[PDB]
Amino acid sequence: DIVMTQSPLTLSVTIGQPASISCKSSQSLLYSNGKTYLNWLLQRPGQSPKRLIHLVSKLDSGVPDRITGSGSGTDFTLKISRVEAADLGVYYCVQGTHFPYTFGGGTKLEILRADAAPTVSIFPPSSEQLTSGGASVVCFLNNFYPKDINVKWKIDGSERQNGVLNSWTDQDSKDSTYSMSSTLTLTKDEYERHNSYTCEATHKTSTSPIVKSFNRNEC
Amino acid sequence: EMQLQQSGAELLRPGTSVKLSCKTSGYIFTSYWIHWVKQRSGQGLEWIARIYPGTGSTYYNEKFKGKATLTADKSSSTAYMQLSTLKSEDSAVYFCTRWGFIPVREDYVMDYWGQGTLVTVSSAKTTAPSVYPLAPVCGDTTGSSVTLGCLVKGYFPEPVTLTWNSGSLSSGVHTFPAVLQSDLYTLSSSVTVTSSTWPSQSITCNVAHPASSTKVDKKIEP
Numbered sequence: 001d002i003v004m005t006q007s008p009l010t011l012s013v014t015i016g017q018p019a020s021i022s023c024k025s026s027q028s029l030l031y032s033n034g035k036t037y038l039n040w041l042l043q044r045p046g047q048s049p050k051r052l053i054h055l056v057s058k059l060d061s062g063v064p065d066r067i068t069g070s071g072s073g074t075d076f077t078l079k080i081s082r083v084e085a086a087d088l089g090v091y092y093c094v095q096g097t098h099f100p101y102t103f104g105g106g107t108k109l110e111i112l113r114a115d116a117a118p119t120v121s122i123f124p125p126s127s128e129q130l131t132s133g134g135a136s137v138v139c140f141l142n143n144f145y146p147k148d149i150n151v152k153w154k155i156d157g158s159e160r161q162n163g164v165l166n167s168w169t170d171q172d173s174k175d176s177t178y179s180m181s182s183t184l185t186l187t188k189d190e191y192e193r194h195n196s197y198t199c200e201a202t203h204k205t206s207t208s209p210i211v212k213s214f215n216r217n218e219c
Numbered sequence: 220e221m222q223l224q225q226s227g228a229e230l231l232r233p234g235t236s237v238k239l240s241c242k243t244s245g246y247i248f249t250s251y252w253i254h255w256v257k258q259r260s261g262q263g264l265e266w267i268a269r270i271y272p273g274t275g276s277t278y279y280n281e282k283f284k285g286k287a288t289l290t291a292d293k294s295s296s297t298a299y300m301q302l303s304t305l306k307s308e309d310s311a312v313y314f315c316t317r318w319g320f321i322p323v324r325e326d327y328v329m330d331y332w333g334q335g336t337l338v339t340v341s342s343a344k345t346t347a348p349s350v351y352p353l354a355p356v357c358g359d360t361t362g363s364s365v366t367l368g369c370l371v372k373g374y375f376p377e378p379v380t381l382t383w384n385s386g387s388l389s390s391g392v393h394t395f396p397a398v399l400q401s402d403l404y405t406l407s408s409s410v411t412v413t414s415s416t417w418p419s420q421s422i423t424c425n426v427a428h429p430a431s432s433t434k435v436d437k438k439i440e441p
């Protein structure tokens with residue numbers, strides 16, 4: 001089958017700047033009728049894919065002409081002349097010249113923006129949960145940029161690496177930021193045996209760890 | 220207006236089969252090819268097969284012969300794809316699409332896609348989630364604004380539906396992707412409001428887990 005190689009794997013561009021994606025094929029995509037069936041698709045977060053270009057450079061109806069496609073043979077390029085917020089997502093090249101049809105691996109386009117320090121929130125176990133014999137301590141690290149961040153949990157001054165569950169959101173199309181959730185789960189008995197619970201983050205926006213904690217006690 | 224409506228998420232046992240449906244409207248069903256595409260783990264797309272409903276003619280990607288069987292019902296304008304003897308690699312999201320290529324004109328018409336059907340191949344059992352309200356203490360963000368949370372855990376399989384104030388509250392909410400651990404998923408969502416709103420007016424977390432017929436509303440009390 002034809003192998004389609006896309007580069008780069010990800011690109012970070014500031015709104016207003018140009019961006020271009022490359023797609024290389026293992027066989028020439030020139031069909032015997034002289035036509036080249038190379039398409040470009042965009043799959044926005046949580047959406048189905050959508051065709052942007054067909055026949056190498058022809059734009060589908062309703063697609064902004066800021067988008068341009070070019071190439072022939074085994075080399076093709078998609079170029080966005082001016083990046084906008086709505087351009088966030090994954091771009092794929094697909095060939096229909098040889099059977100079976102094959103797709104490239106995709107290129108994720110992320111909007112490069114100003115650094116943003118996380119807004120951190122920490123939540124102790126709810127009464128309902130404690131009742132069931134479990135205890136989860138949740139920490140939300142909201143709206144930060146860049147995406148690269150490191151969070152560690154500490155109980156009474158010692159790092160706890162077991163029982164941690166982390167989840168991240170994709171880039172927000174409203175402000176180009178990322179958010180992440182970290183949950184530490186313990187038994188109710190162990191929870192009620194410690195004092196301090198600390199959510200500690202490492203991020204570019206600070207030379208020292210970003211900290212949020214609480215002391216569980218009684219009264 | 221063209222519309223391709225796909226069937227709901229499926230949890231399938233290893234070795235069994237499923238029939239997915241793609242109901243179309245807004246165009247002459249018998250005049251265009253319907254293609255089926257598979258997406259695994261995220262950015263990993265594959266072309267499966269295509270069918271021309273008008274005649275029932277089909278073509279398959281060799282990899283999928285014997286795995287997928289496409290049919291179409293002209294009377295209801297519905298395309299189906301049956302997947303047989305499911306195994307690990309079959310867990311994925313499947314899309315149907317009216318690709319829009321017109322051979323005679325050697326040109327295209329707009330592509331319309333279904334929303335996708337998620338298939339989970341597992342023998343693990345269905346479990347309803349526990350929903351816990353997360354009221355601040357330190358996660359108060361002081362005054363100005365405050366963030367509340369909702370923790371959904373111990374459920375199987377995906378998906379779960381989580382909203383705030385029955386959909387009314389959609390701004391400042393962050394719903395995190397569920398993470399699988401020990402055969403059970405965990406999901407959480409945060410909502411940031413002004414100090415002036417909460418606890419003054421009530422904020423409620425709404426959760427639904429279709430697979431187990433669970434629907435629960437949790438109120439964030441202080």
Ligand SMILES: O=[N+]([O-])c1ccc(O)cc1
Nearest residue numbers: 094095096101254316318
């Ligand atoms: O994704 N699709 O439905 C496709 C992709 C490429 C192609 O040539 C035909 C159909």
Ligand SMILES: [Zn+2]
Nearest residue numbers: 027097098099
């Ligand atoms: Zn060929």
Ligand SMILES: [Zn+2]
Nearest residue numbers: 032097098099
């Ligand atoms: Zn050939």
Ligand SMILES: [Zn+2]
Nearest residue numbers: 155156158194
């Ligand atoms: Zn200790």
Ligand SMILES: [Zn+2]
Nearest residue numbers: 156193194195
């Ligand atoms: Zn000690």
Ligand SMILES: [Zn+2]
Nearest residue numbers: 156193194195
């Ligand atoms: Zn301790």
Ligand SMILES: [Zn+2]
Nearest residue numbers: 156193194195
């Ligand atoms: Zn101690």
Ligand SMILES: [Zn+2]
Nearest residue numbers: 054058326327
């Ligand atoms: Zn055209």
